[model samples]
Target: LFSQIIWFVDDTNVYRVTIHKTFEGNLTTKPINGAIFIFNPRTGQLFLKIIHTSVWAGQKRLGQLAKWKTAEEVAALIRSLPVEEQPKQIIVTRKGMLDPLEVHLLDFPNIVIKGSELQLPFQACLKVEKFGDLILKATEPQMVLFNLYDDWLKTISSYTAFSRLILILRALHVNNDRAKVILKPDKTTITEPHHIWPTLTDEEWIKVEVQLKDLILAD
Candidate 1:
């Protein structure tokens, strides 16, 4: 799975790419992680042939993440373009979720577009397992929700965050439930298992009718 993806541009033409999407599933995580992706200016879409993963003490906090750090992959991808299609500079595209990756990729400015006047495209929504499993379905057209990863990596040790998030889910009078809260330890310790009824289909996942409320009982 790609850690990040975006559409970019040069002086004239437009393009989408995943130069930052990493693949550490194949590499050991004690100190260093491995990731890769590729895009030809010729293809209608971008793709990352990578592993799905996470790690405790990433290369930043430990050793070095200097591999593939030069952005030659992008230069080569652009080089593959027919002479006229090459861009002098990646002009623009969607933007968000940097500041975190800033210092990490300082050498590669093209991979780190910035500033407030920036316009964005679609918001991103996005995976993996341990033991480095092979690509399960290669092209899974349907997906959502993930189980858990490792603990030192700060994965939910248990699946109970389902309702911990759902408790805040109680306060929302909105169309969907997505929460952002920091749990107070003793205030909400892990209990028994919780239920997570979900969309039955890809269609349902995108546009489900919300009829959970029959009446407002403030009376």
Candidate 2:
């Protein structure tokens, strides 16, 4: 069963405390020179030994100087303590979980370029698809697809491929049954494909060209 217990420690001295669990017994408290004994009703356990002992100059107010330990480690330590001192519950704090896709993007460095002029790895160009579809016809597909996230593109420059891709799709405004990324490249094709976007402004289009050059050089 999952359980937790709070133990009080003195502010001045470090003490080794023992715990006990008892199901049926009269609860009582006793004070020794450097330790005290108490029974707990929360867990059905009995204490037959002093809960903890203090070292020299070790008596401080309760609830001082506490440290965090992993649940497994804490459980093991509690078990090793006196039988009566063993705690029933182990306290664990909940942590937020990461999205699998986001995690992959962040942990993998090659997914995007880190410097000023943002570019995907040379091999990733073929792998980058409008919507997970392979667009680049190349031997190494993985290289083309990597580092193609809209966010990454935006960060490297004011122009974002994600936004551009979205705008193109919005402009088409067609009812083509085929996947958005798979449409053929034709001006009046009713549905514009990934590579069919009209030429960008010299300033806007230069970034993509620069990125392609960087990828070639890096390879």
Candidate 3:
């Protein structure tokens, strides 16, 4: 199952919290503190044991110190967003039930489905300036596509459908079926086809430059 991992740390302690979204899309957090052991086959004895216990202990300490901000703080942060930027309330149907299950995006991670696997909503590893931005982070990079030609910007969530982006790009009314864009110029980085929209550089932006000649260049 897909999961989100977050590390909460202080000078004295640190905790690793794993977030799992249930089938019904509920985000749950758990601190990991466990062991891993290796057995020596030739010797037929125990080889090594790894006891990773900081997370659990740190979590306990953090809780004692009240380090992780309260849910009320998170709610207040969400409420502070402009009406348009706030998470839109959505209705969803549970797998087995016929009646609609009402879910507010604020109550759950903003999940974006990628194929059959649900990507981790908290995997972007970006800096969070506000408490609510943590809720917005997704498994993939969050981006804003800027149009150099038209001077407009479109914000994209992580794991967003590739076709959906093309549709949005098409609506930008660029001349071609595909618009030429720029990314890592050296091509040194191994780019995943499905995950192409790298969150370039705060919800970073990639500018859309339309060359004058290529604007109408024949294929």
Candidate 4:
């Protein structure tokens, strides 16, 4: 079953995280902590403990503490970091001029490694109406995938994308019968979901897989 987790950003630097009771069966309940790990997609570096609730009241407070002058400041920090310490991918949401901060490491130029380049396997589009609903329409098949947040902690991290993707798929009750596979893309549309799936045959899958393997294997 898909677990229901609530994530809300207040005007301050604090994030309110709550798990729905309906999905809490057998799940351990723990107190929410202030520490947060931010991924830098541009440099493929994972920044540790960048945001701590103990230090800042909320997102706004954290933004102020960082002396971030604009939405770009957050991206600037990721770009400034060395490639060895950056995250491979991430996503963010833009609230406003000074609201819930929208920051992601992948928003910078380093998202694609020096020698590696990856592209969308097929044409994908997402549309959102003013009513807050999302519409995801893809021209071809797609797959939903994610890298494990914990595996990045190790020095020689393996391709835990399969495991992480499985967990997400299991959560959403997505099965082989689904028409499309979803991926957690670096960029997200306000009206669309943060997942993608490809519509491809075995041969096409192999082609895309090769590109993905090369990108992931690249330093």
Candidate 5:
């Protein structure tokens, strides 16, 4: 559900956070996304939140509170922070069906840390749908697998991809059995419906995934 939950206090004593995680039960050809948030220490409460979502063709990463403030205003808030204080962005270096997802974080030479890194002291209250909530108070910068809003976006993408691939398979006159063979030959079971599979394992959807990568990366 979640993977990396990174946070640090800047020279200004502001708490900043960033997240990278995987989501399940979605239609996205690829199911990875990230987020960033800002915490105002003065108020001792969450002040800003950002998530990558939307469906203007594909995913769009936008900040919270751009409704009252300009998009640039929200962006400038991040830019005003020391370069090192800015949220980190992850970039995938290699990806494929067989290959392990190799990734790297982008560097910001323009950003600098003005103060020594402080001990991260914070807790997260997590929700697990009907399972209920979890608050890890003893854990600072917690690393756990949990779901969130971006997970919802993943579900949307997965469903969209599933329907598109199913329609294409139907148009090609590929029968349900052949479609299953073309998609997940060995792993697919008799009970499995090819059209319902969230991931497109065949080359037919490679182009669509590549194009969607542009939309996701544009964020």
Candidate 6:
């Protein structure tokens, strides 16, 4: 049961992180290694994943190493944000908890950190055949994760109940959400109907992971 968490998030004060995921690279068009995306949701103005490659990718790669930056480095970058850009809410996504990275975001107790589900099922929703076509067409899991988020923003712009989608998903983050989710959009906030929690625990979520494994295998 939810212990009743009601919070207000200022858009200019939120951030998100993708805990690095990896698959064996072909070492051809792309070489070997893993990656994570540090997003600036503190302001809705800057959003992009860099090493599917971008200029930020260049800066993030400031060293000559073959690997992407470490989780500690990601945490460092978030902390290094200018005063006006500090994050009050941070959402971290992956299959499980990221205590090491998250421990860094806690300059205070109220810094909101919510977890999204295993990245696969979260990504699968966009390509589930009802929402739309596959929003991502890549071999990597993080790309699927990014595309689904991009889809969410687009949906927010087009639908009245769009913002609450995240609320429901977050409730099911670890579904029978007997609990309702409140969405704080631009001007007004909406209370959303519940979604059955998809899985009770991350351990139980393996069922979904199996399906996602098959979907991507055959995709």
Q: Which run of 10 residues does model 2 get worst, by summed lDDT?
A: 7-16
For candidate 6, what is the TM-score? 0.31
Question: Using TM-score as the measure, which candidate wins?
Answer: 6
In model 6, where do residues sit more than 4 Å from their true spots?
1-34, 40-70, 95-97, 108-110, 118-219
Instruction: Give the higher-lDDT candidate: 3 or 4.
Output: 4
- Number of the top-ranking candidate, with lDDT as the measure: 6
**Which lDDT tens digits does candidate 6 get at residues 12-90?**
1112123444576433233322234344331122222222223234343333321223334445545565744555555
Off by over 4 Å in 2: 1-141, 145-162, 170-196, 200-219
lDDT of 5 by residue, 1-219 (tens): 012212222111111234445476544333212222233221222223322222112423322222212222224555566765454422211112011111111133332222222222121111211111212132222212222222224434534533443243242232333333443434533222221233443454565444433333442
- The TM-score values for the models, in the order shown, are 0.26, 0.18, 0.23, 0.25, 0.21, 0.31
Sort by TM-score, best first: 6, 1, 4, 3, 5, 2
Which candidate would rank higher by TM-score, 3 or 6? 6
Location of the lowest summed lDDT over 10 successive residues in candidate 6: 7-16
lDDT of 3 by residue, 1-219 (tens): 111321111111112357999999999887532211111111111111111333234344543322122222223434555654433332111121111111212344552211212111111111212212422332322212222111112443322332233332332233323432332333453333323333343222333322312432432
TM-score of 2: 0.18
**Tens-digit lDDT string for candidate 4 (1-219):** 112111111122223233545554655422232212233322222232222224333334434444233224345544675866443433332234233233333344444222112221111111112101211222222222222232332432223433333333332332222212222222341112332332233354444445444433441
Deviation in Å, model 6, residue 32 alpha carbon = 2.6
- Candidate 6 overall lDDT versus native: 0.33
User: Which has the better lDDT: candidate 1, or candidate 5?
Assistant: 5
Instruction: Report the Cα lDDT for candidate 4.
Output: 0.30
lDDT of each: 0.27, 0.28, 0.27, 0.30, 0.29, 0.33
RMSD of 6: 13.9
Q: Ten-residue segment with the worst summed lDDT in candidate 3?
A: 91-100
Better of 2 and 6 by lDDT: 6
